[PDB]
């Protein structure tokens, strides 16, 4: 279930890739192992789009979407938008968002039914997210954290958050989401869980430097087995 991979000898999986229940996204790179791992874990199950967003290698921190839709940031060029439309099936909606804080991957953390959004998000963007993705608007700051999209990773089976999350905040957020949440480190103490790992309803991806206790905690929370 849980697979360990690396990009350019780095554990920033959440920065160099993005995953969803109906598709996966990866950045441009010369390493064939990065694509091979995703192909083996998913293969024909869902498409794996090898492409960039705004010409950046931080596609993981730029993309913000679920299996229902994909709200690309402002920096997404017309050519990139056309390529994404061609790569993705018509079943998945694609739309661009004009935002002064368009780092959507870090600003917004969302799953197939709920979208955690940094209070700095605008009402228009939150309403568009709720409409297109069919998810609730959750203006929250996890235990005072500012970048939920970078310090959290929500799946339909469970959620992972940064270690410093308070027990009361974790319990309240888990009750609101109707799914369990666990606070833990990734990539041997990396507090940026959202940037260090990605997860979906059936697959978890982490860095090759993830320790055994961290891997066990991740597996227990996400209940992939």
């Amino acid at each position: 279930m849980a697979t360990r991979t690396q990009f350019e000898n780095s554990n920033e999986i959440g920065v160099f890739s993005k995953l969803t229940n109906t598709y996966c996204l990866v950045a441009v790179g010369g390493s064939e192992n990065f694509y091979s791992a995703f192909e083996a874990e998913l293969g024909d199950a869902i498409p794996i789009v090898h492409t960039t967003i705004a010409g950046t290698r931080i596609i993981g921190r730029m993309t913000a979407g679920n299996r229902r839709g994909l709200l690309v940031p402002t920096q997404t060029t017309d050519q990139e938008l056309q390529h994404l439309r061609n790569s993705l099936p018509d079943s998945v909606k694609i739309q661009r968002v004009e935002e002064r804080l368009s780092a959507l991957g870090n600003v917004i953390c969302c799953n197939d039914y709920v979208a955690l959004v940094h209070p700095d998000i605008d009402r228009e963007t939150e309403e568009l997210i709720s409409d297109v993705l069919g998810v609730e608007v959750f203006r929250q700051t996890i235990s005072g954290n500012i970048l939920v999209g970078s310090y959290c990773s929500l799946s339909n089976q469970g959620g992972l958050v940064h270690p410093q999350t308070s027990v009361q905040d974790q319990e309240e957020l888990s009750s609101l989401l109707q799914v369990p949440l666990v606070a833990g480190t990734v990539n041997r103490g990396s507090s940026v869980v959202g940037a260090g790992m990605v997860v979906n309803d059936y697959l978890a991806v982490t860095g090759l430097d993830t320790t055994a206790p961290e891997l066990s905690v991740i597996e227990s929370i996400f209940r992939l087995q």
Binding site: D78, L81, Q82, Q95, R96, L101
Partner: protein
Amino acid sequence: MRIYQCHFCSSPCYPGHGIMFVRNDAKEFRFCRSKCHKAFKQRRNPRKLKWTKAFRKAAGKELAVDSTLTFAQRRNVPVRYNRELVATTLKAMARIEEIRQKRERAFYKNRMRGNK
């Protein structure tokens, strides 16, 4: 590639020309030339400057709103790359440009009341 409308003049600007300014507000302060960039920095508001389309359209020196300009919408979604759409766009764009060019002189004549 992308051609950007100048903030100070609204004219098209191509890549590799001029210098863009990135303010803390993170907005595309793109300008065609250093002259326009410096005018914007000095705050020679285009709506008050005689030689910019922003002022001309507002004051009626040129056509303000028309069908030829409304169709220039920033589409939020792409298209599925159909040849019929490309052919229709090729047929329509030249005629729309010619119509807008003629309507520019039409608006000039309309404003020319007193000498027309």
